[PDB]
Structures are given as C-alpha cells and as structure tokens.
Amino acid sequence: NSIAIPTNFTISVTTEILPVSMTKTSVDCTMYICGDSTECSNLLLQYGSFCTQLKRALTGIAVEQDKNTQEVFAQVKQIYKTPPIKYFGGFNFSQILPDPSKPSKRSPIEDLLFNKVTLICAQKFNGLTVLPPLLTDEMIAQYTSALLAGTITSGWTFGAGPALQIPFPMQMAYRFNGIGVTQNVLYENQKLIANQFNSAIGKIQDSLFSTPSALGKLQDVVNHNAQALNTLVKQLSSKFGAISSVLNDILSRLDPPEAEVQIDRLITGRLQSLQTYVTQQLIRAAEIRASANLAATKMSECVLGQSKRVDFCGKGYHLMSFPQSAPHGVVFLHVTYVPAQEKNFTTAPAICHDGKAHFPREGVFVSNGTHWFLTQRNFYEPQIITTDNTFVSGNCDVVIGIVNNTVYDPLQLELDSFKEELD
Amino acid sequence: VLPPLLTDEMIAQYTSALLAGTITSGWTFGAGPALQIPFPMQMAYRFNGIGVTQNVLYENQKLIANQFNSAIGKIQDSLFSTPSALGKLQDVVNHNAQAL
Amino acid sequence: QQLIRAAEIRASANLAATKMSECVLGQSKRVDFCGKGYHLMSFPQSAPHG
Amino acid sequence: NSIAIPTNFTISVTTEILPVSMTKTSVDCTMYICGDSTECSNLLLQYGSF
Amino acid sequence: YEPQIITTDNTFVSGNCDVVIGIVNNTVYDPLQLELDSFKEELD
Amino acid sequence: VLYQGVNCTEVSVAIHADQLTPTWRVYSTGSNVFQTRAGCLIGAEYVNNSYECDIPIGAGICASYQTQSQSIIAYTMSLGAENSVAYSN
Ligand SMILES: *[C@@H]1O[C@H](CO)[C@@H](O[C@@H]2O[C@H](CO)[C@@H](O[C@@H]3O[C@H](CO)[C@@H](O)[C@H](O)[C@@H]3O)[C@H](O)[C@H]2NC(C)=O)[C@H](O)[C@H]1NC(C)=O
Ligand SMILES: *[C@@H]1O[C@H](CO)[C@@H](O[C@@H]2O[C@H](CO)[C@@H](O[C@@H]3O[C@H](CO)[C@@H](O)[C@H](O)[C@@H]3O)[C@H](O)[C@H]2NC(C)=O)[C@H](O)[C@H]1NC(C)=O
Ligand SMILES: *[C@@H]1O[C@H](CO)[C@@H](O[C@@H]2O[C@H](CO)[C@@H](O[C@@H]3O[C@H](CO)[C@@H](O)[C@H](O)[C@@H]3O)[C@H](O)[C@H]2NC(C)=O)[C@H](O)[C@H]1NC(C)=O
Ligand SMILES: *[C@@H]1O[C@H](CO)[C@@H](O[C@@H]2O[C@H](CO)[C@@H](O)[C@H](O)[C@H]2NC(C)=O)[C@H](O)[C@H]1NC(C)=O
Ligand SMILES: *[C@@H]1O[C@H](CO)[C@@H](O[C@@H]2O[C@H](CO)[C@@H](O)[C@H](O)[C@H]2NC(C)=O)[C@H](O)[C@H]1NC(C)=O
Ligand SMILES: *[C@@H]1O[C@H](CO)[C@@H](O[C@@H]2O[C@H](CO)[C@@H](O)[C@H](O)[C@H]2NC(C)=O)[C@H](O)[C@H]1NC(C)=O
Ligand SMILES: *[C@@H]1O[C@H](CO)[C@@H](O)[C@H](O)[C@H]1NC(C)=O
Ligand SMILES: *[C@@H]1O[C@H](CO)[C@@H](O)[C@H](O)[C@H]1NC(C)=O
Ligand SMILES: *[C@@H]1O[C@H](CO)[C@@H](O)[C@H](O)[C@H]1NC(C)=O
C-alpha cells in the first residue's frame, strides 16, 4: 500500500543528433584508371561495362542523398513566419529562431552547430569530384524556420491540415493534458515552466559550445567519406606488380607489347580499388538512409505532433520538439516533463462507503497518514473524494485491500440544507 | 575473436534492473525517478491503458494472476520442448562460424 | 559480407532497443508492436548475442 | 445493428527473439595472406593499404 | 466547432481567479442550483 | 548542358581556343551562360521568378522548360508559399 507521487516537476531539454545526408561524390572511371592515356583506355574497354556500373552506383547514391535531405526537412507545405512581436507567454525562443541580423539567417544554435563541424577540386584531382547538395544550407535553414514557426504558433495542427493559431500557453496546456497532467498545473505554474524552459535552452548552448565531442556523429560521417576518398587516391601510387605506378613512364620507356602488360596490371589494381570504394559507399549510403528515415520519422512524430512512444522523443514524458539544421544532418531539441520531488503516500485500490466499492475515475486514492484524497497520477494535488471523482462497481467484499472512508455525495448535502427547516 | 565489452553477467544485471524497475515502479522509472506503486494498481493503470476499467482487474485479480502464472509456465515449456524456438540467434552464430 | 551482416544486425539491434524502450519501459498502443493482442506489459530476458 | 462484445478475457504471454550483437572478429591481414613469410609480405606491400 | 454553454459539468475548478494569466469574467451555469430556485420557488 | 566544377570564364576561353575535348558546341550566346555552384550552365536563361523544382541542377538551382514559344530556363527553386500565422495572446 505504498505509492510515490511527484510534488514538483522539471522541464528538461535534451539533444539528439542524426545524420541525414552524405557527401555526394562522382568518379570519372576512365580518368582514374587510365588518366589521359589512350592505350590504357583501349585496354580498359576489354573489361566490359564496369565503369558504367560504378557510374550508376555513385549517381544513385547522390540522388538518394538529395532524397534523404528532402524527406527529412521538406515536410511542411508552406513556409511559416513568426509574428513581428516574439512574445509567447514568456517562453524565449530567440536562440532557436532565425537571427535576422546575421547572413544566412540561422539561429544562434544553428550557427554554433555549423561552426563546430568542419566546389573547386583543388584536392584529389584524379577524376574524383564532389557535387553540391540540391538544397543549400540557407534553404535547409528556411525549412527549419518554417517548421519551428509552425510549431510555435500553430502547435500540432499545421502537420495535419491548415495551420490554426493557438496561444502558446494553451498549446502547452494541451501538451500537458497529453502527458496526463491537468491544464491548471501549467497555468498555475506558467512562470516557473517558462523559466525552466529558458534555462534549459541556455544549458543546451553551453553544452554544445563547451563539448567538442557533442557532434561526433556528424563529424564521423565527414571523416569517413574524406578517408575513403584519400584512400582511393592513395591506391594510385601502388604498383600492383608493375615496374611503375605512372602510366606516362610506362608508355615513355616501353614498346606497346610490354606496356600493355604493365598497364593491365595497373588497370586491375585501380579497378579493384574503385569497386572497393563503391561497395563501401553503397553500404554507408544504406546506413545514412536508415538514419535519414529515422530523422524523418522523428520530425513528423516529435516536431509535427506529440508522441507517446517512450524515449522516442527524448528522455521523460514528451511535450514538444524543435528541429535545428546541422551540416549533413539534423539536431532535435526535445522538451520533456520530468517528475521531481516525489512524496511517499499510503494508497488503496478503492474506498468502501455504504457497502459500495468506489474506484477513481482519473487518479489514485492517497492518504497523508490521516485523510484520504484523490490525486492525478503525475502531480500531487489532493482533492476531496466525491461521487464526481469516483464510480461505483460492485460491493466492498470483492476488492482486495479496500479501506473504509467517507465518499462525499455533493447533491445529498444540498437535500439536507435546502429544506432542512421543512417549511 | 574479441570478447564483448559487457559480460553475460553484466547483461543479466541490466536485465534484472529493468525487470525490477518494471515490477516495482511500472513505467515511471523510464521517464524520471522510479516511483513505487503496488503491482495490482500498476496493472489497473495498464488496464485503463488498453481501455478496460480498473474494477475489471480488481474484481478478477486472482483470475488474472493465475492466467499470468500459467502463461509463464507455458513459455518455459515452449522454449524447453521446441529446439527451433531460438533459431534466429543460432542462425547468426552459424553464419559467422561458416564465414570464418 | 561481414559489413552487410553487421548492417542487418544493427537494424535488428535498433528494433530491439526501440522495443525495450516502448514495451518494457512503457505501454505501447502500436498494434502488434509488443506482441499479439492489446499490450499490457513486457519483460526482457538476456540471451546469447540477443 | 449487431455487435459482439467480449464477456471474458485471457492473459497471454508470447515470446519475441531478436539478435542484438554479432561475434566480433579480427584479422591479421599479413599473417593470413603471407603467414610468417618476408618475401610474401614484401610483395603484399605493392597492393597498397588494403 | 460546436459551441456549448459553459456549465459546471463541462469545467472543473482549481484555485482562485488571481493566479491564471489572462482569465476573463464570465458566468458559469450551475445546472442543479437553477432547479433549487425553481423546484421550491414558492416555498410551499 | 552543365560543365561541372568549372568557372564559365574557363569554359568560354576553352571554347574560344578550340581546346575543349568534346567536339560538340552549344550556342553560348549572351544571357544563356549562367554561373551556379554546381558548374557552368550553358543553354538556359536565368530568371528571377522562382517555381517548384522540376529538373534539379544543384546548389539551389533547378531548370524547367517554360513558355515565356518555349525555352529552357534556370531559377532558384521555391520552397513553398508563404503563410504568416495570425498569432496573438
Ligand atoms: C531571451 O534570451 C536571450 C538570452 O538567451 C536574451 O538575450 C540578451 O540580450 C542582451 C542584449 O543582446 C544581452 O545583454 C548584453 O550581453 C553582452 C554579451 O553579449 C554582455 O556583455 C552585456 O553586459 C549584456 O548583458 C543579454 O546578456 C542577453 N541575455 C543573456 C541571458 O545572455 C533576450 O533578451 C531574452 N529575450 C526576452 C524577450 O526576454
Ligand atoms: C519546485 O521546484 C522549483 C525549482 O525547480 C522551485 O522554484 C525554485 O525555488 C527556489 C526557492 O524559492 C528559488 O531559489 C531562489 O531564487 C532566487 C532568485 O532570485 C534567489 O535570490 C534565492 O536566493 C533562491 O536561490 C529558485 O530560483 C526557484 N526556481 C525556479 C526555476 O523558479 C519551486 O519552488 C518548487 N515548488 C515546490 C512546490 O516545492
Ligand atoms: C472466464 O474464463 C476463465 C478461464 O479462463 C474461467 O475460469 C475457469 O473456470 C473453470 C470452471 O469454473 C475452472 O475449471 C475448474 O477448475 C478447478 C480447479 O481446481 C477444477 O477442479 C474443476 O474441475 C474445473 O476444471 C477453471 O480452472 C477456471 N480457470 C481459471 C484460470 O481460473 C472463468 O470462470 C470465466 N468467467 C466467466 C465470467 O465466464
Ligand atoms: C492531511 O491533510 C489534511 C487536509 O489538508 C490536514 O488537516 C487539515 O489541516 C489544516 C491545518 O494544516 C486544518 O486547518 C484543516 O482544518 C485540517 N483538515 C481536516 C479535515 O482535518 C491534515 O493535518 C494532514 N495530515 C497530515 C499528517 O499531513
Ligand atoms: C468497514 O465498515 C464495515 C461496516 O462498519 C465493517 O464491516 C463489519 O466488520 C465487522 C468486523 O468484525 C463485522 O463483524 C461486521 O459484521 C461488519 N459489518 C458489515 C455491515 O459488513 C468493515 O469491517 C470495515 N472495514 C474496515 C477495513 O475496517
Ligand atoms: C471580474 O470581477 C471581479 C469582481 O467583480 C473584479 O474584481 C474587482 O476588480 C476591481 C478592479 O478595479 C477591484 O477594485 C475590486 O476590488 C475587485 N473585486 C473583487 C471582489 O476582487 C475583476 O476585476 C473582474 N475581472 C475582469 C477581467 O473584468
Ligand atoms: C512511506 O511512509 C511510511 C509511513 O507512512 C514509512 O514507513 C515508509 O518508510 C515511507 N517510505 C520510505 C521509502 O521511506
Ligand atoms: C571566375 O573567375 C573570375 C575571374 O576570371 C572570378 O572573378 C569569379 O569569381 C570566378 N567564379 C567562380 C564561380 O569561380
Ligand atoms: C501579449 O501580452 C504581452 C504582455 O506583456 C504584451 O506585451 C504583448 O504585446 C501581447 N501580445 C499581443 C499580440 O497583443
């Protein structure tokens, strides 16, 4: 018969970082294997359409990466704007909203994320090029801004139909009902909640600013693709059994009948290097696709709604989420309600009054040692146990652990006062 | 072959912690501090979750506990008597052994 | 082949972690996600490699 | 105008088995290709950083 | 949109009027009290 | 056509000098050569009117065949219609 019930709460903001896209690469198979060498190219033709398959695999990856970015961020039909007066019940969103004074119009947090993670082929000029993404960083920031403005001014309604404006504190009140806490808890404590939110956001900036490893998930993607390309270029210096790694030297010193042997050895080595590179890129692309699909699911369920999936949208009971753009990925700020300062109370499954078994409609019966009250499960708020708060099913001889207490009938009390005097 | 970082005992300890949390605190340990609740009341809340009132559980608490205990015994009999029950894990072991 | 199987295992592990969070540390209203029927509760058990 | 309503219920327990981890392997590339052979290792070096 | 009269059946009470920000003044209709003033309006 | 990763000046010079390896040529007249981050786009007139993306080019630029007779145009793609929500207390 012992139950603990939170008497306070904390608004917590946590960060989830997910890759969305990968560097899009393109390889000129002939230049890589047989750079500016007719004799090598003519020998390369005897291996069939391998360069063509490699071209399709890399093109398919590049297209998929643009699909992944589009699927994660372009989830809003319209580009929403916040009002000129950025007052939302006392909730300060200035560190997640676009900063209009800076070029690129990114929020302070997005600018930090872009500064922490690190067109002309100056490097790796061996047939290996990088294609730009279809959406620019500014376009991604604009989608993020639209999603954020939608959530702040319209709540969850913009994600399932037209955007419907609602005062922010009432949006929060609905989110509180979602987790299972009544609206009056929010309204009575609105200033406390706004202050806890603002503090948590400041902590997010301090955490990202002071922790170099915070964005490791995105940096690892950048590092792995850079390493893959550096390895692919390094394989060109290998001899693979040939007298020289340079085709110009082989053609310069040897007659065609010998050069073809040395060239074929190099063609085999370079072709194997390209197949290894492309296979690894296909595997990483599949991994990124899975991550992007998770990010898109989280965008739809955490940002454009309220999720009741445990730990899906941060640790704690989910209230709301806000997206932020990051290089090659997305960062979600998950705002949750965390119970705090629980108190230890006596409980019972039912109250026995006049032989009837009374069960709570929305809550748990608790006792502060001497008196029985009905409370909401997630926030201590004792109320008198009445026939409005409970329902009756069966008698007192069935429920195990039933305790004896008065249930107050609101109407019967009137019957004994309204005509107490008879006349 | 490199050993795993967590030993079988450590995994068993995590499983035990998760089970003790669920049994004594219900769903509250997964979203904040663990809050104790009597088990039949946890079940009552779970019944409200599916859309059945609390009195159904309390009136039939003994029946429900007996059905649960019987079902667990059946789980042990099913796993004990069916060699193929764990095929999903054995296939992973067999495929990596075959690859090597 | 090990990279491909590793990706398959990763997907399985991600599903298992999702199920741990939603079935064991909560109550799920997703149909057939946490067993057949209306979900009440789940209990994890350790197994070799799973 | 016909509806069916359960008058009883069954508590059912089912089992879901998921892989979580794979055997962790490590390969000494040089020993496998060129086991304890200097001549082979020196030839192996010509294939680059495979 | 389906407007209904605000009554004690539709709302719940928690605290006083000096805590909630943006509270407005309006009548909440008590369904039972109206009967108390009609059922024995005449006293006899 | 799009010449990837190159400055339009370098392409124009390579065309003038008869150095460019592919032997076909695109008319390359005034206002049909547009510099993008993806590369040098030749054969499409750039306009300041955004539209939904049709054929992607890159770095925010898409091209489409439009009536303006009809010709291929390049534009910065639109992300969506603007809707300012009437938020209030
Ligand atoms: C919403 O929160 C932000 C902070 O997250 C508040 O920004 C405040 O902006 C003012 C003016 O830019 C800052 O004042 C000055 O900052 C510099 C450092 O940049 C400092 O050296 C000066 O002494 C002075 O403090 C102020 O510090 C900054 N607040 C914080 C906490 O850093 C913004 O005002 C808040 N908006 C609303 C509507 O409450
Ligand atoms: C529930 O918890 C919150 C904290 O999460 C409690 O509010 C906190 O109350 C303490 C004590 O009243 C405040 O500390 C004081 O702050 C002032 C700020 O000027 C300072 O001058 C004092 O010396 C002292 O440190 C604290 O700031 C306040 N926190 C917030 C975020 O408002 C709240 O009272 C608790 N409620 C219950 C019912 O116990
Ligand atoms: C709802 O279904 C349950 C079964 O899931 C019914 O309970 C079962 O009732 C039968 C008949 O009363 C019990 O069988 C008897 O069991 C005793 C055990 O000692 C045995 O000696 C008798 O010969 C007979 O087999 C059965 O055990 C019992 N099962 C459980 C799990 O309690 C229940 O009555 C049904 N309720 C309604 C409202 O129909
Ligand atoms: C349990 O709660 C009741 C009700 O809040 C407490 O009794 C009240 O105490 C206040 C003083 O704090 C009195 O003014 C009220 O008249 C009391 N009400 C009743 C119905 O007796 C009670 O003291 C609390 N007990 C414990 C152990 O915390
Ligand atoms: C709740 O109150 C009822 C009625 O006062 C108690 O029921 C009585 O319990 C005594 C126990 O010795 C019996 O002898 C009486 O015959 C019972 N009366 C009735 C009308 O049922 C009940 O025990 C009380 N429960 C608790 C938990 O104190
Ligand atoms: C709602 O009604 C109450 C009571 O009529 C108003 O409260 C009064 O407000 C005036 C404002 O000048 C005060 O001088 C009185 O002392 C208050 N009386 C009481 C009993 O509190 C309240 O202002 C009204 N609210 C609105 C929004 O109009
Ligand atoms: C809860 O309260 C009871 C007394 O009502 C006390 O004996 C018990 O120790 C308390 N629980 C804890 C965890 O201390
Ligand atoms: C192209 O070259 C000119 C100088 O000839 C330079 O001013 C311009 O910025 C370059 N453009 C690009 C896109 O590199
Ligand atoms: C909302 O109320 C605040 C109270 O300070 C006020 O500053 C703000 O201008 C009001 N907003 C609107 C849209 O009237």
GROMACS .gro file of N, CA and C in nm, chain A residues 87 182-184 187-191 381 383 410-411 414 418-419 422-423, chain E residues 12-16 19-21 32-33 35-37 39-41 43-44:
model
  108
   87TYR      N    1   0.652   3.736  -2.854
   87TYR     CA    2   0.611   3.712  -2.716
   87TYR      C    3   0.522   3.589  -2.719
  182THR      N    4  -0.310   1.783  -1.561
  182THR     CA    5  -0.419   1.874  -1.593
  182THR      C    6  -0.368   2.012  -1.633
  183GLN      N    7  -0.456   2.087  -1.701
  183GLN     CA    8  -0.422   2.219  -1.753
  183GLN      C    9  -0.390   2.320  -1.644
  184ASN      N   10  -0.455   2.308  -1.528
  184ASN     CA   11  -0.431   2.406  -1.425
  184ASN      C   12  -0.289   2.397  -1.371
  187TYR      N   13  -0.111   2.637  -1.591
  187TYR     CA   14  -0.146   2.778  -1.577
  187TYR      C   15  -0.103   2.832  -1.441
  188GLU      N   16  -0.117   2.753  -1.336
  188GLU     CA   17  -0.077   2.800  -1.204
  188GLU      C   18   0.073   2.823  -1.196
  189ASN      N   19   0.151   2.739  -1.264
  189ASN     CA   20   0.297   2.743  -1.266
  189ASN      C   21   0.354   2.794  -1.398
  190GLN      N   22   0.279   2.872  -1.476
  190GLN     CA   23   0.326   2.914  -1.608
  190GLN      C   24   0.461   2.986  -1.603
  191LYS      N   25   0.482   3.072  -1.503
  191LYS     CA   26   0.609   3.145  -1.497
  191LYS      C   27   0.725   3.052  -1.466
  381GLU      N   28  -0.196   1.669  -0.606
  381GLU     CA   29  -0.297   1.774  -0.598
  381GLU      C   30  -0.417   1.712  -0.528
  383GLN      N   31  -0.757   1.617  -0.366
  383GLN     CA   32  -0.895   1.662  -0.377
  383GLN      C   33  -0.983   1.574  -0.290
  410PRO      N   34  -2.208   1.524  -0.341
  410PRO     CA   35  -2.237   1.671  -0.342
  410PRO      C   36  -2.387   1.706  -0.333
  411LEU      N   37  -2.477   1.643  -0.410
  411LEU     CA   38  -2.625   1.670  -0.408
  411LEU      C   39  -2.692   1.635  -0.275
  414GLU      N   40  -2.697   1.907  -0.024
  414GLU     CA   41  -2.796   2.013  -0.051
  414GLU      C   42  -2.933   1.970   0.001
  418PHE      N   43  -3.115   2.257   0.188
  418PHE     CA   44  -3.216   2.331   0.113
  418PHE      C   45  -3.350   2.335   0.186
  419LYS      N   46  -3.399   2.220   0.233
  419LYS     CA   47  -3.525   2.212   0.309
  419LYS      C   48  -3.501   2.157   0.449
  422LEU      N   49  -3.793   2.218   0.677
  422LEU     CA   50  -3.919   2.162   0.626
  422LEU      C   51  -4.008   2.264   0.555
  423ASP      N   52  -4.033   2.380   0.616
  423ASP     CA   53  -4.112   2.486   0.553
  423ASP      C   54  -4.020   2.592   0.493
  635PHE      N   55  -1.399   2.224  -1.462
  635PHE     CA   56  -1.357   2.185  -1.328
  635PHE      C   57  -1.294   2.307  -1.262
  636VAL      N   58  -1.292   2.308  -1.129
  636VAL     CA   59  -1.240   2.420  -1.052
  636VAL      C   60  -1.111   2.383  -0.981
  637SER      N   61  -1.010   2.469  -0.995
  637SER     CA   62  -0.884   2.453  -0.924
  637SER      C   63  -0.827   2.591  -0.894
  638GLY      N   64  -0.824   2.630  -0.766
  638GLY     CA   65  -0.771   2.760  -0.729
  638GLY      C   66  -0.867   2.874  -0.752
  639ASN      N   67  -0.818   2.995  -0.725
  639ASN     CA   68  -0.894   3.118  -0.739
  639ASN      C   69  -0.857   3.193  -0.868
  642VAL      N   70  -0.460   3.379  -0.998
  642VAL     CA   71  -0.339   3.307  -1.036
  642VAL      C   72  -0.325   3.295  -1.187
  643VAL      N   73  -0.433   3.262  -1.258
  643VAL     CA   74  -0.424   3.235  -1.401
  643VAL      C   75  -0.407   3.365  -1.479
  644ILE      N   76  -0.310   3.367  -1.569
  644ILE     CA   77  -0.281   3.483  -1.653
  644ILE      C   78  -0.378   3.483  -1.770
  655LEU      N   79  -2.780   2.218  -1.130
  655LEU     CA   80  -2.860   2.190  -1.007
  655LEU      C   81  -2.910   2.316  -0.934
  656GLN      N   82  -2.828   2.418  -0.921
  656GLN     CA   83  -2.870   2.537  -0.844
  656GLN      C   84  -2.992   2.595  -0.918
  658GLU      N   85  -3.236   2.447  -1.048
  658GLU     CA   86  -3.353   2.369  -1.001
  658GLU      C   87  -3.390   2.414  -0.860
  659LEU      N   88  -3.291   2.439  -0.775
  659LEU     CA   89  -3.314   2.474  -0.633
  659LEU      C   90  -3.395   2.603  -0.632
  660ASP      N   91  -3.366   2.695  -0.723
  660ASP     CA   92  -3.450   2.819  -0.731
  660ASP      C   93  -3.581   2.798  -0.809
  662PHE      N   94  -3.773   2.456  -0.816
  662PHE     CA   95  -3.845   2.346  -0.754
  662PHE      C   96  -3.928   2.392  -0.634
  663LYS      N   97  -3.870   2.471  -0.543
  663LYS     CA   98  -3.941   2.526  -0.428
  663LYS      C   99  -3.941   2.678  -0.430
  664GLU      N  100  -3.954   2.737  -0.549
  664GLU     CA  101  -3.957   2.883  -0.559
  664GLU      C  102  -4.068   2.943  -0.474
  666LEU      N  103  -4.194   2.824  -0.194
  666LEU     CA  104  -4.177   2.781  -0.055
  666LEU      C  105  -4.269   2.665  -0.015
  667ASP      N  106  -4.399   2.675  -0.041
  667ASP     CA  107  -4.493   2.568  -0.012
  667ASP      C  108  -4.523   2.487  -0.137
   0.00000   0.00000   0.00000
